[model samples]
Every structure is written in C-alpha cells, then in structure tokens.
Target: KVFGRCELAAAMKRHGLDNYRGYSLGNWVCAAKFESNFNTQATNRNTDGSTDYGILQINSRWWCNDGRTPGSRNLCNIPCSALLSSDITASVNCAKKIVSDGNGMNAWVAWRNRCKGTDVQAWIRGCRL
Candidate 1:
C-alpha cells in the first residue's frame, strides 16, 4: 500500500540508501520484493514461530515486538507496528542496523536465495536513480 519498487527506491535513496551498507538500490529493492512484495503492512510467520514485519521482513525474534510473541528481543528497539506503517523510515533504519552487523544483505533469506548473485537492475529499472 505504501510503495512499489520505484517509490521504494526513491524513498530509500532519500534516506541515504543509494549505496547503503555496501548494497545498491537494486539489490535492496530486489530483496524487499521477495520479502514483502513491497507492502509495508505485510506480515508473515516464520516456521520457527516468529513473524517477519514490514517490507524488509525483519524478524520478531530479534528486531521488533509483537507482544503476544515472546522474547521480542527488539534489537532495533522499536515496536513491530513501526514497520507496518506506510512511512518506511523506521523500517529502513532498522534494516540498516541489521545489515550493519557485517552480514550485508545476507540477514535476509530472500536476499541470499533470490537476490544473491543476480542482476537486480529490473527492480529499479525505470526510476533512473
């Protein structure tokens, strides 16, 4: 509901993700595509009883909180709802911290499985930045 690839790319760039964490706009966009299909409110449960929140699908086990879910480690120190909003600043910031752990985009399984070693140009094809 918030953004597709182009808008997402623009927002990301505006938030300084043009080359954040050593990853490109295309790379991040591609990962987001598989993680949440660019839907900000998207939420999916992992097999391990944790949920992934927002366009980046950040895990509840360590990054954000959903009170019913235990251990809510909240590494990003924000409520899970923050990521579900149309304004993605929090999600982007959390993702930055996640990647800052030196894992690069590998923190996302979608990135490793779908975006890794792939030419993600089409994800940002028409945005022109």
Candidate 2:
C-alpha cells in the first residue's frame, strides 16, 4: 500500500516513538519502516513463491530459527507472513534477542547512536559498549 513516511512516522509515534531525540529508539521502527511502509501485510520476493512478510518483512523460512521454545519469547514465533500479523515491537524485540544472543540488545542503541533521525546507517561505526 506504500503508506508514506509520514504514515510510518505516525505509526512510530503510536508505538512510544513520539520524538527523535538524538536516538534511534531501537531499530525496530527503522527495520519495520524499511521492510514495509508500516504496512502489516507487505511482502517482497524470495523463492518458490516465498516472500518477506508482514511489517517486519521477515523471511518465513529463516524466521522460525529464532528458537520458538514453548512459552519462550523468541523471534521465530512472529513470522512476518501471518497476514493479519503486525507486531513490529515484539518481533523486533525478539529479533533483538536473537541478534544479541541473550547478552545485550545493543542494536537498538547502535541504531540510536548512529541512525538517529536521518542517517540510518550512522550507528554501524563500531558500536562500543
């Protein structure tokens, strides 16, 4: 549906992101905005008719690898393919765990410290701490 950036900004605001104070507020919004225009049902191409799904644009096959143990909060449980699914916060939080390996979810901090408002890739300059 190609909802504009303003729309995405609104969604970001709806999810406790009313301001962009020298921080990225966790790359959840960044990734979500990139994957989909905040469009929950957005999907892209992959293979065998497979596609990046939902607002997170997560790969269905690879998403389940997040370790969806029973009652465990893992990214695998929130595949982007589920048409009516749109929980970028939960999905990103879980993905954050996967990326951090239970050590420390630094991506968010990295995103904030780098991307901030306009420069989405600034945080990649070796996130220390």
Candidate 3:
C-alpha cells in the first residue's frame, strides 16, 4: 500500500507510534516519506548486503530476519516479510522497538537528514490527525 500522508499518520497512531519515543507523529510521517514514500512493499538492499524493509525501512541486519542477511539479530523476532504487509502493525511495533533500544528516531537516516532538527509538523500539515 502506498499510504497517503494522513493515512500513514493515523495508522501509526492506531498502532501506538504517536510520540512512542518522544518523537511526534510528523516525525514518523516525514521519515516514511523520505524512506519509502509511504509504500508498504518498499525494500532497499544496503552495500553491506543487509536489506531495509517495508514502510519504516527496518534493517534486516539488526531487526527483522530475511533468512539471507548473515548474522541477523532478528531482534524483532519476525520475518522481514511481515514488514511489507499493508496492516503495518508489525512494522510499527518493530520501529518502536528500534527507538526503545536507545537508537531513537535517529536510527533512520532519512529522519536524521530530513525530519530531525526541522519543523516536522509541516509534514503533517492539513492532516486531521
């Protein structure tokens, strides 16, 4: 699913991402924009042979297990395929774990380069959430 800006915000809120780790809803929305353009099926293979999966682009090296990334921690304890589902529940949960593990939202380079230290609220402007 290619989520609308507001659609992704509301979905993340529903799954407890709204300020889950001191980051606002707009932060998640903006990161999603730069990370996957809100597409649930997005995937990017890193130079290290690890893959980033799904909307929030969770890394296979330390998060989800893709059965291909060597030495995967699989900290989320789920298949990387789960992140690609339209449901987004697993994606949101895994993202929360990433943040809670002390990486914060900075775990996403897109967020650091685009959403961090900026007026992230603009990303969700006009959204009813």
Candidate 4:
C-alpha cells in the first residue's frame, strides 16, 4: 500500500502498532516512513548481496524466503513476496515476531540510522487519528 502519513497512521492503529512492542507510535511510523516511504511493496538490494523485502525492508538472510538467497532462516515463515501487499496482516504479524526476538525496533536499519534518537512524533505531527 502506498499510504499518506495519515492513512498509514490509521492503519497502524488498527494493526496494533500504535505503541507496539514497547516502541511509541511516532517512532514506528517514522521508521516506516524512512524505511520504504510508506510503500508496502518496496524492495531493495543490499550491499551484502541479499534483498530486503517489503516496507520494513526485512532482510532475506533471516526473515523470509525469496528463493535465490542462500541460508534464509525465514524466521517469519512467510513468503517474502507476501510482504509486498496492501493487506498487511502477515507483515504486521511478522513485525511483532521480529520485535519479540529481542531486537526491538533496532532490527530495522532505518530506525537505527534515522529514527533512533530523533523526535519521531514529527512523522505524524499534523495527521488526525
């Protein structure tokens, strides 16, 4: 889904990411914005020669199977392509699982490099819930 900030914010609330897994809604939304610019279908080729799938840019190394990468642990047990969809059920579930793995939001490089310490509330500053 290509979502505006407000639309994504509403969706995140419904997906239980408003304050998911010990992170604030602002931070999560901010991370999502930077990670894929709210593009659910986004994919990126990484410097490590693995692909990143979906909005969160989840790594092929341990998250999902894309059929070409070797040693994909597929911890999410989900098809990597499935993450690239307007329907975010599987994506959200996998996100929760990733967070539960104890990495928290730090698992996302966008969060680490762009949102880790900033006032992320700006991500939704003028959006209505």
Clash counts for all predictions: 0, 3, 0, 0
Q: What is the lDDT of residue 80 in candidate 4?
A: 89
Q: Decide which is better by lDDT, 1 or 4.
A: 1
Candidate models: Cα lDDT each: 0.87, 0.46, 0.92, 0.83
The deviation in Å at residue 29 for candidate 2 is 3.9
Candidate 1 per-residue lDDT, tens place, 1-129, comes to 658679899888888877886788889899888999899999999887888999999998999888857765888999888999888899999999999987889999999999988997778888956
Tens-digit lDDT track for model 2 on 65-117?
32232332324565444432544455444444345443232433433444345
Q: Which sections of candidate 2 miss by over 4 Å?
A: 1-7, 10-23, 26-30, 48-50, 65-75, 79-90, 98-118, 121-129
Summarize candidate 4's per-residue lDDT along 1-129 as a digit string, tens digits.
788887888777788987778787788788788988999999998876688877777888888888878766888998889889887677788888888898799898889999998998887788886
- RMSD per prediction, one decimal? 1.3, 8.8, 0.8, 1.3
The C-alpha TM-scores of every prediction are 0.93, 0.44, 0.97, 0.92
For model 3, how does the per-residue alpha-carbon lDDT over 1-129 read when each residue is reduced to its tens digit?
Answer: 999998898888888888887898899999999999999999999999999999999999999999898887899999999999999999998998999887799899999998899998887788777
The deviation in Å at residue 119 for candidate 3 is: 0.7
Winner by TM-score between candidate 4 and candidate 2:
4
Which residue pairs show backbone clashes in model 2?
24-112, 114-122, 114-123
Top model number, TM-score:
3
lDDT of 3: 0.92
Identify the leading candidate in terms of lDDT: 3
